[PDB]
Design a protein around this ligand. Structure first.
Ligand SMILES: CCCCCCCCCCCCCCCCCC(=O)OC[C@H](COP(=O)([O-])OCC[N+](C)(C)C)OC(=O)CCCCCCCCCCCCCCCCC
Ligand SMILES: CCCCCCCC/C=C\CCCCCCCC(=O)O[C@H](COC(=O)CCCCCCC/C=C/CCCCCCCC)COP(=O)(O)OCCN
Lengths: 59, 71
């Protein structure tokens, strides 16, 4: 089976048109990406303290 | 009395693994966003109107003091 990755058409009701116009004029998805990067900023880093800490190894 | 031991999944298998996209909506409406913008614009305009009228009166007072001193 298969699926289409980009085959949807936007709804043309006045509410949807206004929402898209607000997204265009007020940079909503850009602020969303900013929020994602800020979330990563407040997460904990994954860096080990080499050479005092070593990565995992196996036999 | 030793049995074959091997890397196998647990009885009943593993739990479901999520793979679908999960981008939510997480937003207000365009109408509400525009309303907030217009409201803050109007509040700012009103405040600047009052403050700038006060500044004009202050300038008139300073100019009058200068006129009094000019002779
Ligand atoms: C002029 C200002 C214009 C602002 C953007 C206009 C659009 C508003 C908008 O998208 O609103 C969505 C939202 C309002 O929330 P909302 O209610 O629309 O939806 C957000 C999602 N929920 C529903 C969960 C709340 O606005 C914001 O997120 C505002 C933050 C944007 C900040 C952009 C940079 C400016 C600030 C700089 C200093 C930051 C502190 C320093 C440290 C930085 C980090 C290291
Ligand atoms: C009472 C009557 C009042 C009358 C005034 C009414 C005005 C209020 C409503 C209108 C305001 C509209 C906002 C004006 C800015 C819009 C800019 C714009 O044109 O939007 C984007 C253009 O802007 C961008 O694309 C931005 C790209 C760069 C983004 C990278 C940084 C932005 C993220 C940081 C957020 C910035 C926050 C600003 C803080 C300022 C602090 C001083 C559209 O471009 P396209 O989507 O490509 O399509 C156009 C052709 N089809």
């Amino acid at each position: 089976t298969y699926k289409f990755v980009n085959m949807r058409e936007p709804s043309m009701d006045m509410k949807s048109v206004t929402d898209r116009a607000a997204q265009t004029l007020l940079w909503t998805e850009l602020v969303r990406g900013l929020g994602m990067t800020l979330s990563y900023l407040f997460r904990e880093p994954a860096t080990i303290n080499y050479p005092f800490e070593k990565g995992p190894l196996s036999p | 009395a030793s049995k074959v031991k091997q890397d196998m999944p647990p009885p009943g298998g593993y739990g479901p693994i999520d793979y679908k996209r999960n981008l939510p909506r997480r937003g207000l409406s365009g109408y509400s966003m525009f309303a907030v913008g217009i409201g803050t614009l109007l509040f700012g305009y009103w405040s600047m109107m009052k403050w700038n009228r006060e500044r004009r009166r202050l300038q008139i007072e300073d100019f009058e003091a200068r006129i009094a001193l000019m002779p």
